Write a protein that binds this ligand. Structure first.
Ligand SMILES: CC(C)[C@H](NC(=O)CSc1ccc(Cl)cc1)C(=O)O
Ligand SMILES: CC(C)[C@H](NC(=O)CSc1ccc(Cl)cc1)C(=O)O
Lengths: 164, 162
């Protein structure tokens, strides 16, 4: 909730590696490209953008935010950021079959299995998986998320966020 | 961390709770003033994990309400997660006494350009839960405006997605 400032420099192709999305008259980070200027200043999926070059993003369309970034004079772009403000952590325990009890697609939880640790702990659907046991899984394929869950110990801590 | 709470039904057999199904969970939509619910610390936005040791996962609002109504005895147990969607934003009134938002039915509907609300990233389609620690769930819009108009310069609002 406490804002922080980041300075980006456009790469060789003139890009910062960011897709922004207008939600509820705010601006949120929808995509950070691996190894991008955005990635290197710590921008993450679900970050809220309060200011671009000291101008308020309030009520901006996705297009406007993107036009402002594209037209930005010179190499140096400032953003005022709230770090993943809607991020929440839930702890589950694997059952005798090694399952916590949820289905997901494209890193979004789609159903909760009856009588599972996910059910007991009130895990929610229409939430994106951000981290498993402190490991960032944004941008991983579903099979890679399953690989991490399958190799986990009994305790599974998942960081979630309401989906875009 | 969830907590377990014990409610004793009032003289009418009620706990003073309205529940809502969201994202295959169950959430507190209303806590009646001075109700058994109120007295064990339940608030708008609390998540209900268990009622009498049964998982609420995937229950309709109706089912949660039927289970509460059918509960035999003086004593109802719930497992509660404290307001997991709760977000607090601090704003400062401008020279005209405004923070810079419009709301309707306790729900923020627009952010005024160049306002404290704009600078602080206040969001629309969010319900106002508290103003400076005071609960405003169930208040009429004009009563919410009265509280904002009476506030000091510092306005801390607790919001939640609608
Ligand atoms: C992986 C765990 C979350 C496990 N759940 C599932 O296997 C169903 S979800 C899934 C979806 C796409 C792929 Cl590629 C792999 C798994 C559990 O409930 O513990
Ligand atoms: C009330 C505050 C939030 C103030 N905002 C407004 O005057 C516009 S919103 C409003 C809606 C319904 C009623 Cl009945 C009264 C006011 C501000 O921007 O500080």
């Amino acid at each position: 909730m406490d804002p922080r400032e980041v300075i980006l420099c456009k790469d060789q192709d003139g890009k910062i590696g960011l897709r922004l999305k207008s939600i509820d008259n705010g601006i949120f980070v929808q995509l950070v490209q691996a190894n991008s200027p955005a990635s290197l200043v710590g921008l993450r999926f679900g970050d809220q953008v309060l200011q671009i070059n000291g101008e308020n993003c309030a009520g901006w369309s996705s297009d406007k935010a993107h036009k402002v970034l594209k037209q930005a004079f010179g190499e140096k772009i400032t953003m005022t950021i709230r770090d993943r403000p809607f991020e929440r952590t839930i702890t589950m325990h694997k059952d005798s079959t090694g399952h916590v009890g949820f289905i997901f697609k494209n890193g979004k939880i789609t159903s909760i299995v009856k009588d599972s640790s996910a059910a007991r702990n009130g895990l929610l659907t229409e939430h994106n998986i951000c981290e498993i046991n402190g490991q960032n899984v944004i941008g991983l394929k579903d099979s890679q998320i399953a690989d991490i869950l399958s190799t986990s110990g009994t305790v599974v801590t998942i960081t979630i966020m309401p989906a875009f």
